Amino acid sequence: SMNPPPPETSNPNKPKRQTNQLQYLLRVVLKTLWKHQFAWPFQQPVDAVKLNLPDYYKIIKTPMDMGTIKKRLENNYYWNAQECIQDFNTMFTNCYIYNKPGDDIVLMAEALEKLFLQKINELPTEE
Ligand SMILES: CCc1c(C(=O)N(C)Cc2cccc(C(N)=O)c2)[nH]c(C)c1C(C)=O
Numbered sequence: 001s002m003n004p005p006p007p008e009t010s011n012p013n014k015p016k017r018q019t020n021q022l023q024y025l026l027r028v029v030l031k032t033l034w035k036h037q038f039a040w041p042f043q044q045p046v047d048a049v050k051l052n053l054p055d056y057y058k059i060i061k062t063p064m065d066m067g068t069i070k071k072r073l074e075n076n077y078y079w080n081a082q083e084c085i086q087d088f089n090t091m092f093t094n095c096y097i098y099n100k101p102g103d104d105i106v107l108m109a110e111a112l113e114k115l116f117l118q119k120i121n122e123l124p125t126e127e
Pocket residue numbers: 040041042044045046047050051053094095098099105
């Protein structure tokens with residue numbers, strides 16, 4: 001069994017921009033979600049080999065996780081906040097697509113998503 005390569009986190013050809021919204025996503029949104037008691041299943045790419053989920057990457061073709069998001073934020077991978085917000089949304093949706101409603105992993109995802117959306121409501125205006 002094999003995992004795919006992880007999502008891209010370095011590309012010197014991709015133009016980059018530091019923005020107050022992106023700083024907010026790292027400083028406030030990611031940091032807050034990362035420390036949450038249910039963050040641990042989302043802090044790295046799903047290891048389908050270790051977890052014995054050989055169909056995972058048959059079902060999930062755009063994998064995403066907070067470890068990848070943290071790296072993208074910390075090493076300034078993004079141009080805008082919407083790119084990052086999309087990554088969070090993809091992580092949550094993948095979980096809801098792959099797992100059954102009311103699986104523990106889904107309850108965890110929903111808790112994080114609720115917190116995520118609350119923080120996104122305070123996304124600062126672009127300076
Ligand atoms: C339920 C499996 C799962 C987890 C999960 O439980 N994880 C990823 C922690 C873990 C366990 C076992 C091993 C490891 C390691 N990385 O070594 C990590 N997270 C997600 C998004 C899912 C699914 C299928 O949606």
